[PDB]
Design an enzyme around this catalytic site. Structure first.
Site, PDB file in Angstrom:
ATOM      1  N   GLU A 129      25.752   0.360  61.437  1.00  0.00           N
ATOM      2  CA  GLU A 129      27.251   0.334  61.827  1.00  0.00           C
ATOM      3  C   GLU A 129      27.373   1.306  63.140  1.00  0.00           C
ATOM      4  O   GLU A 129      28.146   0.880  64.004  1.00  0.00           O
ATOM      5  CB  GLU A 129      27.861   1.177  60.845  1.00  0.00           C
ATOM      6  CG  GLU A 129      29.468   1.050  60.930  1.00  0.00           C
ATOM      7  CD  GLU A 129      30.330   2.050  60.017  1.00  0.00           C
ATOM      8  OE1 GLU A 129      30.172   2.886  59.710  1.00  0.00           O
ATOM      9  OE2 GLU A 129      31.407   1.462  59.755  1.00  0.00           O
ATOM     10  N   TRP A 182      31.603  -4.012  56.125  1.00  0.00           N
ATOM     11  CA  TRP A 182      32.768  -4.530  56.558  1.00  0.00           C
ATOM     12  C   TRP A 182      33.064  -5.857  56.032  1.00  0.00           C
ATOM     13  O   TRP A 182      34.172  -6.432  56.646  1.00  0.00           O
ATOM     14  CB  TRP A 182      32.669  -4.487  57.947  1.00  0.00           C
ATOM     15  CG  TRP A 182      32.808  -2.973  58.558  1.00  0.00           C
ATOM     16  CD1 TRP A 182      31.874  -2.572  59.064  1.00  0.00           C
ATOM     17  CD2 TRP A 182      34.018  -2.475  58.750  1.00  0.00           C
ATOM     18  NE1 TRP A 182      32.251  -1.180  59.430  1.00  0.00           N
ATOM     19  CE2 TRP A 182      33.453  -1.230  59.253  1.00  0.00           C
ATOM     20  CE3 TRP A 182      35.401  -2.448  58.290  1.00  0.00           C
ATOM     21  CZ2 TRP A 182      34.263   0.051  59.405  1.00  0.00           C
ATOM     22  CZ3 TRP A 182      36.312  -1.529  58.597  1.00  0.00           C
ATOM     23  CH2 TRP A 182      35.923  -0.276  59.115  1.00  0.00           C
ATOM     24  N   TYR A 211      37.012   0.441  66.229  1.00  0.00           N
ATOM     25  CA  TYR A 211      36.252   1.516  66.692  1.00  0.00           C
ATOM     26  C   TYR A 211      35.423   1.414  67.920  1.00  0.00           C
ATOM     27  O   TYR A 211      35.955   1.739  68.969  1.00  0.00           O
ATOM     28  CB  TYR A 211      35.249   1.960  65.767  1.00  0.00           C
ATOM     29  CG  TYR A 211      36.138   2.640  64.546  1.00  0.00           C
ATOM     30  CD1 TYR A 211      36.790   3.869  64.559  1.00  0.00           C
ATOM     31  CD2 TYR A 211      35.933   1.963  63.303  1.00  0.00           C
ATOM     32  CE1 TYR A 211      37.364   4.415  63.366  1.00  0.00           C
ATOM     33  CE2 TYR A 211      36.448   2.302  62.192  1.00  0.00           C
ATOM     34  CZ  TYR A 211      37.332   3.702  62.196  1.00  0.00           C
ATOM     35  OH  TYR A 211      37.969   4.040  60.976  1.00  0.00           O
ATOM     36  N   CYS A 237      40.129   5.340  60.120  1.00  0.00           N
ATOM     37  CA  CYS A 237      40.341   6.636  59.368  1.00  0.00           C
ATOM     38  C   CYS A 237      39.653   7.875  60.211  1.00  0.00           C
ATOM     39  O   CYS A 237      40.194   8.824  60.242  1.00  0.00           O
ATOM     40  CB  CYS A 237      39.283   6.546  58.215  1.00  0.00           C
ATOM     41  SG  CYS A 237      40.214   5.316  57.147  1.00  0.00           S
ATOM     42  N   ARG A 276      41.940  10.875  59.258  1.00  0.00           N
ATOM     43  CA  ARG A 276      43.061  11.047  58.644  1.00  0.00           C
ATOM     44  C   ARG A 276      43.307  10.640  57.103  1.00  0.00           C
ATOM     45  O   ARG A 276      44.113  11.041  56.292  1.00  0.00           O
ATOM     46  CB  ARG A 276      44.311  10.191  59.370  1.00  0.00           C
ATOM     47  CG  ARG A 276      43.966   9.070  60.279  1.00  0.00           C
ATOM     48  CD  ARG A 276      43.671   7.885  59.539  1.00  0.00           C
ATOM     49  NE  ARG A 276      44.515   7.393  58.598  1.00  0.00           N
ATOM     50  CZ  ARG A 276      44.745   6.049  58.073  1.00  0.00           C
ATOM     51  NH1 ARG A 276      43.972   5.147  58.717  1.00  0.00           N
ATOM     52  NH2 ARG A 276      45.477   5.768  57.151  1.00  0.00           N
ATOM     53  N   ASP A 327      38.172   8.902  51.490  1.00  0.00           N
ATOM     54  CA  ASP A 327      37.712   8.339  50.189  1.00  0.00           C
ATOM     55  C   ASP A 327      36.684   9.360  50.130  1.00  0.00           C
ATOM     56  O   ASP A 327      35.256   8.990  50.328  1.00  0.00           O
ATOM     57  CB  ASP A 327      37.407   7.141  50.165  1.00  0.00           C
ATOM     58  CG  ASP A 327      37.017   6.308  48.667  1.00  0.00           C
ATOM     59  OD1 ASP A 327      36.242   7.174  47.877  1.00  0.00           O
ATOM     60  OD2 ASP A 327      37.074   5.167  48.665  1.00  0.00           O
TER      61      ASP A 327
HETATM   62  C1  LIG Z   1      33.266   5.136  55.719  1.00  0.00           C
HETATM   63  C2  LIG Z   1      32.814   4.004  55.902  1.00  0.00           C
HETATM   64  C3  LIG Z   1      32.124   2.590  56.171  1.00  0.00           C
HETATM   65  N1  LIG Z   1      32.634   1.789  55.162  1.00  0.00           N
HETATM   66  C4  LIG Z   1      33.950   1.216  55.349  1.00  0.00           C
HETATM   67  C5  LIG Z   1      34.938   1.305  54.356  1.00  0.00           C
HETATM   68  C6  LIG Z   1      35.767   0.597  54.583  1.00  0.00           C
HETATM   69  C7  LIG Z   1      36.969   0.340  53.252  1.00  0.00           C
HETATM   70  C8  LIG Z   1      36.803   1.301  52.376  1.00  0.00           C
HETATM   71  N2  LIG Z   1      37.795   1.422  51.357  1.00  0.00           N
HETATM   72  C9  LIG Z   1      37.540   2.393  50.282  1.00  0.00           C
HETATM   73  N3  LIG Z   1      38.429   2.216  49.418  1.00  0.00           N
HETATM   74  N4  LIG Z   1      36.649   3.106  50.466  1.00  0.00           N
HETATM   75  C10 LIG Z   1      35.815   3.360  51.347  1.00  0.00           C
HETATM   76  O1  LIG Z   1      35.008   4.700  51.449  1.00  0.00           O
HETATM   77  C11 LIG Z   1      35.940   2.568  52.464  1.00  0.00           C
HETATM   78  C12 LIG Z   1      34.782   2.551  53.512  1.00  0.00           C
HETATM   79  C13 LIG Z   1      31.950   1.635  54.015  1.00  0.00           C
HETATM   80  C14 LIG Z   1      32.112   0.394  53.003  1.00  0.00           C
HETATM   81  C15 LIG Z   1      31.612   0.473  51.734  1.00  0.00           C
HETATM   82  C16 LIG Z   1      30.851   1.444  51.225  1.00  0.00           C
HETATM   83  C17 LIG Z   1      30.202   1.462  49.983  1.00  0.00           C
HETATM   84  O2  LIG Z   1      30.745   0.768  49.225  1.00  0.00           O
HETATM   85  N5  LIG Z   1      29.362   2.187  49.775  1.00  0.00           N
HETATM   86  C18 LIG Z   1      28.244   1.881  48.659  1.00  0.00           C
HETATM   87  C19 LIG Z   1      27.239   0.846  48.940  1.00  0.00           C
HETATM   88  C20 LIG Z   1      26.745   0.677  50.399  1.00  0.00           C
HETATM   89  C21 LIG Z   1      25.493   0.236  50.831  1.00  0.00           C
HETATM   90  O3  LIG Z   1      24.918  -0.574  50.189  1.00  0.00           O
HETATM   91  O4  LIG Z   1      25.026   0.938  51.926  1.00  0.00           O
HETATM   92  C22 LIG Z   1      27.344   3.206  48.321  1.00  0.00           C
HETATM   93  O5  LIG Z   1      26.989   3.169  47.179  1.00  0.00           O
HETATM   94  O6  LIG Z   1      27.312   3.899  48.937  1.00  0.00           O
HETATM   95  C23 LIG Z   1      30.536   2.547  52.180  1.00  0.00           C
HETATM   96  C24 LIG Z   1      31.145   2.634  53.514  1.00  0.00           C
HETATM   97  O1  LIG Z   2      35.395   5.470  57.434  1.00  0.00           O
HETATM   98  C1  LIG Z   2      36.049   5.146  56.469  1.00  0.00           C
HETATM   99  C2  LIG Z   2      37.035   3.891  56.140  1.00  0.00           C
HETATM  100  C3  LIG Z   2      37.737   4.151  55.114  1.00  0.00           C
HETATM  101  N1  LIG Z   2      37.943   5.145  54.305  1.00  0.00           N
HETATM  102  C4  LIG Z   2      38.757   4.832  53.191  1.00  0.00           C
HETATM  103  C5  LIG Z   2      40.247   5.608  53.470  1.00  0.00           C
HETATM  104  C6  LIG Z   2      40.892   4.917  52.474  1.00  0.00           C
HETATM  105  O2  LIG Z   2      40.501   5.632  51.120  1.00  0.00           O
HETATM  106  C7  LIG Z   2      40.515   3.513  52.336  1.00  0.00           C
HETATM  107  C8  LIG Z   2      40.816   2.390  53.419  1.00  0.00           C
HETATM  108  O3  LIG Z   2      41.050   3.074  54.872  1.00  0.00           O
HETATM  109  O4  LIG Z   2      38.870   3.736  52.717  1.00  0.00           O
HETATM  110  C9  LIG Z   2      37.023   6.484  54.513  1.00  0.00           C
HETATM  111  O5  LIG Z   2      36.991   7.323  53.776  1.00  0.00           O
HETATM  112  N2  LIG Z   2      36.210   6.246  55.566  1.00  0.00           N
END
Ligand SMILES: C#CCN(Cc1ccc2[nH]c(N)nc(=O)c2c1)c1ccc(C(=O)N[C@@H](CCC(=O)O)C(=O)O)cc1
Ligand SMILES: O=c1ccn([C@H]2C[C@H](O)[C@@H](CO)O2)c(=O)[nH]1
Ligand SMILES: C#CCN(Cc1ccc2[nH]c(N)nc(=O)c2c1)c1ccc(C(=O)N[C@@H](CCC(=O)O)C(=O)O)cc1
Ligand SMILES: O=c1ccn([C@H]2C[C@H](O)[C@@H](CO)O2)c(=O)[nH]1
Lengths: 264, 264
Positions: free
Chosen positions: A58, A80, A94, A146, A166, A169
């Protein structure tokens, strides 16, 4: 890690219950800061197994200026997937903002080249900043940024970085964000022949989702292990040609992975 | 104020000496956060006397979208004169970005009326943000934005706000910056029928100038007095219709003013 687990406990003890755009529910606090001395180790959480290959692909995707998940698909990274249009695009998120911020007058600003040139020609600058919060283009994005704004700082031969996030999660995104930016400070310090300093994380709406309460309680009962060490196997000729093969983490011994529902 | 005097002592105890664009030299820390509960009192420093007039007129000027000092001169505010050109102009600084951020396709976004509409219809949004950091226009500005980015949050009927300040002159600018933002949070809360919550200040390069050290230890030897109270005498039709006379500060009994030079 202890700073992270302390913030999790703070959201459970002090958080206000909020209704969020997904209708999932959230426990929420506003305004929090944490400091990570990168001399003391790579800040990759050890109380659950984090998957480093999604984190580094990423980030390399961001530095190439790319907003399409195709590169991420070639590398089996799925993060994504549910935000891309039918053609794999997320709009000017980004990557587009870091590498090519569009002016009203047709031109583009490369904030990463600008920041590299600032750290090498003017290290004491109080303006070594890159922003992804392009108010003129938020409409056009699948998701508003974010990790919105960050700043680099040099003091006694050491590079520090502060992130303003800002929306956070705590259970799912925050482990991923801390390691991603710690990785960038290591890459920047190596290209700029500097030592690593602190990674400072500052958060806005810092929250835990209602359907992450069991997962949080399980992690909150696990003891943090020693932090790993990040080895950068070769020094590329620029910050735009690092490859997945250049990164390694000795000493990474985490507790079991922990699965949790993602909120959309 | 307690938070404020603690910060001065922290950059004295932990700051490193830095060279800076003005050549003056600074003591400097990176990354700091502090919280002001606006229900406890209006956060105007009492260990030296601050000039309210300039604080209120500069906020009113920002809210009009104005970037020319003529207004400030009609009101005896000279705090922006060193940076203004021959025509009184500062370039696209705070007022213009707040009210008319230029997009790539002709449009202009008014971030202040967008924030007011979000606080009324969507107060649980994680996107209630104003940015002055327009990368595309930075080179047209007299000075790059110091109070660069801020975020609102609503919880138990209370309005809170967090500011990211990238560069901070702790002795001269910071007393001004926190009273200005605490004032904006009362004006916004009054318009949205909310009570006031917290003002969270977060700083990047937080510093004391070398030629401010005796003034700083002089101030630091004084006990904080009772914090003043803000009385707004009227509820205007909009955030843009406030006037200097609508505000009254009650109970402000400060220690003697302390003069110090401004860095160029
Ligand atoms: C921040 C950021 C980038 N992102 C983008 C991103 C986009 C929308 C979001 N939406 C929500 N609700 N929470 C997030 O933390 C989130 C993160 C991520 C997306 C998914 C995972 C996730 O589900 N993690 C799992 C599996 C990942 C893997 O297989 O490597 C885990 O167990 O870690 C982590 C980061
Ligand atoms: O890099 C990121 C992208 C998203 N989120 C969270 C914020 C909110 O809970 C949801 C959507 O933006 O996922 C993170 O914490 N980190
Ligand atoms: C922040 C901000 C806006 N600004 C703009 C602004 C622009 C450049 C700067 N440059 C430097 N070096 N420090 C600053 O704090 C600073 C502030 C200010 C400008 C002047 C004063 C000032 O001289 N203060 C009072 C002294 C007494 C008091 O603090 O009440 C004065 O004489 O008017 C304050 C704020
Ligand atoms: O709102 C402001 C504007 C400026 N400064 C300081 C930062 C730096 O020391 C100098 C020039 O930006 O003035 C502040 O602290 N606050």
């Amino acid at each position: 890690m202890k700073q992270y687990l302390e913030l999790m406990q703070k959201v459970l003890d002090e958080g206000t219950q909020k209704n969020d755009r997904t209708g999932t529910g959230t426990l929420s606090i506003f305004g929090h800061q944490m400091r990570f001395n990168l001399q003391d180790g790579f800040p990759l959480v050890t109380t659950k197994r984090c998957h480093l290959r999604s984190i580094i692909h990423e980030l390399l995707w961001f530095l190439q200026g790319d907003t399409n998940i195709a590169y991420l698909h070639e590398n089996n990274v799925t993060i994504w997937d549910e935000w891309a249009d039918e053609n794999g695009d997320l709009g000017p998120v980004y990557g587009k903002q870091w590498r090519a911020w569009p002016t009203p007058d047709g031109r583009h600003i490369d904030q990463i080249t600008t920041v590299l040139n600032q750290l090498k020609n003017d290290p004491d600058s109080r303006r070594i900043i890159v922003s992804a919060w392009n108010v003129g283009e938020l409409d056009k994005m699948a998701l508003a940024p974010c990790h919105a704004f960050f700043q680099f700082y040099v003091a006694d031969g050491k590079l520090s970085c502060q992130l303003y996030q800002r929306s956070c999660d705590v259970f799912l995104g925050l482990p991923f964000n801390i390691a991603s930016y710690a990785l960038l400070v290591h890459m920047m310090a190596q290209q700029c022949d500097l030592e690593v300093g602190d990674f400072v994380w500052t958060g806005g709406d810092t929250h835990l989702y209602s359907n992450h309460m069991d997962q949080t309680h399980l992690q909150l009962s696990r003891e943090p292990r020693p932090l790993p060490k990040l080895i950068i196997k070769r020094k590329p000729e620029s910050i735009f040609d690092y490859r997945f093969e250049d990164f390694e983490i000795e000493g990474y011994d985490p507790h079991p992975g922990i699965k949790a529902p993602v909120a959309i």
